[PDB]
Design a protein around this ligand. Structure first.
Ligand code: FES
Ligand code: FES
Ligand code: FES
Ligand SMILES: [Mg+2]
Ligand SMILES: [Mg+2]
Ligand SMILES: [Mg+2]
Lengths: 568, 568, 568
């Protein structure tokens, strides 16, 4: 027996209640006979343009379930369109996780199918489902087609920062920049660079939570429907075999995902998200793990932002299975995946059709290009930097600090010609973390002063307690914890202070005495409440720091999928 | 100038971000020209069978918006199916209200259209929308068609309690009970009795938050799509006129809703939900308001569970507009509604095609049938009763107490033949309120002891801190506040205590002295935490008592719909 | 006053009959007020996999109509799947044209939108609509994305013939050829080469019956939905201006289409369809017009089967507008199109992003590559050849005839190793035209004898009364009229006869005297009737020859769109 039979299999007065209303639209009674009921978490939304094709994806999963003798039922949760949600989509990631967890536990579901696409929709669904630990399979929406503009190609996000900086440098017209928005995005799917959505989709696959190939298949490609449908077939058998998430999301699975993230030039936001997911399913995973596991690992994928190619090219080259094939000596081969096979059984024979996109391990795209975690007096709980999309000569750098108290203080001063700034200066941004912004917005890749861009300089060192887009680039220190709004030493950085950056030495030092800092702390008053009410008030007072996953403290962990009380 | 232009009217890098991704599915550029952007809150779910036709309602709304030059964008929230969500759907009414609120404020919305149907989905969206106070219109899903079984009609919920008690009384076979579960619910829509869904849909029309006729139209009737489409045309004009919910949900509106709630034989759950809605928009509404404005009014709608007819007969007889015209001497005629006309302008000429369903005021269906609020030592913060469906002989009753410490203990002892109980005892159920159950389930309509059902007695006095299905009946006092789990004197009732009920005198008295209650209070301990993690832990530690609306304390109020900071 | 008000404007018993039933699903009364009723001819079909995305295209047109104040109403016709229908889709092109013509006239339509994709759905809808001559606009479905197979690309149809001939020659394994059917077609849309569908979409734009850019936009590209929705807006204004088809399909329009067909390397099936379309709208057009207009015009588009690239490259280079701009010195610039502008207005400023796909006029991809019409005793009523995909050395050839009496006989003899044939023979196929097959199948591109394929020769001279696929290639003489089954001199060709081909001289000669042909004609008998009843008995007994359009004799012409009588 399984939990859905505690609803539909009842011969009580409640059994009438649990079935009669469901039969109002024409459901045959044998669908309640005890066959696996499959809940399909559908994040479709016309406010989430990257998941706007998920109704077509949902009917595809339902088919596979109907084929394997299951009972498919889709349900909605709060969807998270990254380009639309302000202050930031991350502010509502934890709220969506409660939609997922409660909708799964409260309903007669034996298995779960997760429809994930834009960035924040992947962790929110993974976090919520992990707190229930039912047999779960993830289906990604797929990346968009490559943008086609004036005979060349455009990259999601990566070319937004690039073309924007060129407009402010006087190197690109402002009219041309705005004509490219109908051409950069011409298809269904998520951001088609190696941004958060592409990496999280790769993380879902590398964790074993999806069928092989789930990450790279374009949304408008027919193979995306096949995989969504094959996932509908598989989840029915997963219920019969009781292949729960905890049997897949193990310590080794997370170790493989971090190794793959380094090889694919993955986004820095995967660090926060996988720590949040591990905190729900129960796997021990710290921020120090990310530096130790990705240690000395190379980047094998020549894709934007770290490279030049796009997700469409990454798919035709072999996708994630071809990347896991290169990692055969560092991966945990025996890690189990949701299709019944190991991660190595599904990738040992993966073909590679383009070595200019997916390199061989021993002659890779970039060496030692995994995400690095920095330690120092400036970031006690840690900080991250993505050297694959960085410039080499800046990974070891020290210079004068130019300080911005927040985003409004920054946008004002960055465009100031009277700003005393150089090319070897350190731009510092504060109060943009979980409590500060609030929601830890993607403002880490802050634009450079216009007079610096006019000299051909496109990158300089930058430290902040904020995130940045997975599509962003530059030597940017991110997730400085504790954030300035929580009383972190970052809040005390002042103009003229000396910042020491040493990614090789894992060092981020603030050259001012502890005595000087200590008296600077006498002035620091905590920022006021952003809102005295609502979800944001709950978020700020309960959100954890970025080094733990930015989850709410009372949501950490799991409560299983036991059968609750009846409703009457 | 409206808030969407803060996304779609920006002429910098952020304007590229806010528009380019939206163009990925072929949206013409002129849709971002500042025309009203309409958010359609779609609660469609296959786990919410009463809202399972909401894709059809959503596209019908889109049309009306397209017809009148608006930009429609639908978005999902957590859906709440009564029969599916356990321990009860009320446990997640406040959660989905956060989904609504944050989805409205976080996205570039000018106006909102609320797709509501299944019980809790109506207050869930009204609460979240009121906390933003954008121009909003409500569209109800409509009731199911009358169930046809063996040449006779069945009623949603009401006939479930009736047929179940007849099986327990050895009067109706168990065979006939389950053969009627596919014949009771035969079409799309919500409960076709005057349950919560029918009541709440009538409240939306009474509050003025919908177009006239929104309440009664059966879900499969062509006029249902027409109203949803007419609402799509109206909301864009409401955005142009800035007709926010504040100008609709005034105190006069809530009083009008209370008044028609008595005339239609409305559900007791409307008491809790309208208090929660008022607690968001900022109108002072109390339990005492329900008592003073409601009870003296008669019942005019001969519908189950107060009468015998169903929602189909109620729509063909004239629906809510015909009922309101009968209340012309007691309503606030000048109350503004979303269509631009007053509440009385929309109903002054509403026809009445069947008097046997909608009685005249001077010749009503039942006299003094409004919900009564009982005061006394047993409920210091209040309790409610629905005399429109109760036994007249029992509204004034004194009796010995048969106490049940919880719902599990009730099911154990209720059918125990050794139970010392006659039909003149008072049944007491503890620990089923917001904290105790948790979620305050619909357990107030306790099934009677089988030894008493064999005598032909179908109703006894019943006291509980729990809610009750709007389709239920009998002399049952509900919403006893504070609940037993919070230390309310209901927790101290013991077997043998004399409990006095006098609905006319507004009395619910426990015949135990204060000095003895003080000794009982010393032995009372708060029940252990239902969960040490997750949404349920947050709910138990923050939910208010039923006399205030069963809302979360930090969600109480409103924050408007300002323009939040950029997300990059 | 329009046709619609003869239905919806009637104020009597018939007006009740025409509005009441239409209001059964919830259509507001103001949709019958006189606004343009727009019929959307939807060829969606799961048996027409190239039109299987047309439900999405239909919904986009409805929007455009709702935006502009029209009344959209979609209706189905017989859909024609090229790869699915047998004996051939051409057999059912004239049947589907009767569905289109009668549905437009029988129903209250003021304007028409034609959803066309798969090969035969384009002319069958153009023909039926031209016989009504209402304000009509055409929307093409778009081509599929380029096939991706083992690091390289695959082309629709063209690579099916190539890989097949290499399997028969022993150069490609049989397993590899079948592992490429999942990888050739991997998205919605029609054939991705310059086949009939791509050609017909280019003809619709060249004729002016579509908005600019309609031909090349891939089906899964966002601009495809944009154009379909923009067409829904435009058709309403066309009804108001009464811009009927005959104002677009003038003589200069067909002349412009024939010129574009040469520059794009279009299909030979375009010749038959444009003649049938002209035979409906009332424009005198002949094979001689095809030869004279395309005479020495160059091919500018380097796509398969004439070139190497695919439709994706064609769209990203500029599509048809860029091709028409190259033809600015030969086209009739002032030809009016459905968007109100001339063809030159819509193309004079068209950009060209890839000269390697779309060549300049004076530096063309191939010179004198227009379709050539051959005359001579072997084809008194004409015969066509597509030298854009033929062998230059074979265009002037004299060879001994190797004859096959039918397709069945050709399947047997071709792979016979006893067959006396060399590379300099002339393959002759009989009885595969309109009456012969029946339906004139795409059997003209005969597979070569394996003993010659193994010698490295992939092209021989081939003559038949059959058609060729638009994706086919080689020195293939086609559409020999009158067909063999109609008594044409092709039926009298015997093994050993000398056949002279001279494309430059426009000569196809059979070296047999008239006196000897007269003796052979005596023994000739018409083949038995394919069937004794049904559609194909009517087809065979009424279809005209390929030199006139292969239309049915009694369907030739038009009848307008008058107001028929009342159905009651
Ligand atoms: S915005 Fe959807 S993934 Fe980049
Ligand atoms: S079950 Fe949805 S209305 Fe009661
Ligand atoms: S198969 Fe439909 S276009 Fe060729
Ligand atoms: Mg992101
Ligand atoms: Mg209820
Ligand atoms: Mg064809």
């Amino acid at each position: 027996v399984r939990r859905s039979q505690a609803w539909f299999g009842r011969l009580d007065r409640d059994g009438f209640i649990y079935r009669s209303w469901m039969k109002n639209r024409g459901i045959p009674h044998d669908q309640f006979d005890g066959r696996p009921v499959i809940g399909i978490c559908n994040t479709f939304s016309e406010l989430t343009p990257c998941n706007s094709h998920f109704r077509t994806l949902a009917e595809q999963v339902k088919i596979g379930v109907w084929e394997s003798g299951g009972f498919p039922l889709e349900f909605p949760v709060m969807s998270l369109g990254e380009t639309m949600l302000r202050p930031t989509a991350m502010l509502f990631r934890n709220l969506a996780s409660m939609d997922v967890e409660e909708s799964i536990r409260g309903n007669p579901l034996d298995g779960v199918v997760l429809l994930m696409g834009c960035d924040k929709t992947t962790p929110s669904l993974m976090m919520g489902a992990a707190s229930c630990d039912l047999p779960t399979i993830g289906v990604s929406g797929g990346p968009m087609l490559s943008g086609k503009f004036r005979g060349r190609e455009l990259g999601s996000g990566t070319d937004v920062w690039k073309m924007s900086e060129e407009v402010r440098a006087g190197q690109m017209s402002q009219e041309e920049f705005f004509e490219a928005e109908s051409c950069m995005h011409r298809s269904h799917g998520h951001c088609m660079t190696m941004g958060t959505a592409s990496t999280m989709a790769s993380m879902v696959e590398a964790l074993g939570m999806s069928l092989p190939g789930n990450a790279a298949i374009p949304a408008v490609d027919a193979r995306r429907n096949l995989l969504a449908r094959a996932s509908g077939r598989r989840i029915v058998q997963m219920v019969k075999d009781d292949l729960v998430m905890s049997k897949i999301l193990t310590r080794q699975a997370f170790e493989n995902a971090i190794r793959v993230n380094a090889a694919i030039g993955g986004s820095t936001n995967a660090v926060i998200h996988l720590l949040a997911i591990a905190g729900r399913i129960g796997v021990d995973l710290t921020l120090a793990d990310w530096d130790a596991l990705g240690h000395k690992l190379p980047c094998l994928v020549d894709l934007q932002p770290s490279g030049t190619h796009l997700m469409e090219d990454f798919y035709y080259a072999g996708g994630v299975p071809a990347v896991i094939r290169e990692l055969g000596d560092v991966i945990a081969r025996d890690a189990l995946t949701v299709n019944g096979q190991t991660l190595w059984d599904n990738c040992k024979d993966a073909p590679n059709w383009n070595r200019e996109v997916i390199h061989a391990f021993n002659e890779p795209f970039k060496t030692e290009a995994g995400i690095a975690v920095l330690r120092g007096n400036l970031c006690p709980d840690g900080a991250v930097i993505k050297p694959s999309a960085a410039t080499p000569a800046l990974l070891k750098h020290k210079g004068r600090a130019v300080v911005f108290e927040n985003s409004e203080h920054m946008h004002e001063r960055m465009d100031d010609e009277n700003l005393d700034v150089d090319e070897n200066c350190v731009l510092v941004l504060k109060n943009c973390g979980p409590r500060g912004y609030p929601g830890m917005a993607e403002a880490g890749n802050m634009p450079l002063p216009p007079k610096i861009l006019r000299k051909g300089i496109t990158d300089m060192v930058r430290v902040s307690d904020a995130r940045m887009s997975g599509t962003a680039y530059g030597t940017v220190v991110l997730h400085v914890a504790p954030e300035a709004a929580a009383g972190g030493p970052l809040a005390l950085v002042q103009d003229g202070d000396i910042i020491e950056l040493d990614v090789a030495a894992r060092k981020l030092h603030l050259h001012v005495s502890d005595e000087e800092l200590a008296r600077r702390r006498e002035a620091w008053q905590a920022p006021p409440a952003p809102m005295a009410r609502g979800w944001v008030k709950l978020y700020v007072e309960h959100v954890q720091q970025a080094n733990l996953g930015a989850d709410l403290d009372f949501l950490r962990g799991k409560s299983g999928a036991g059968i609750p009380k009846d409703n009457h």
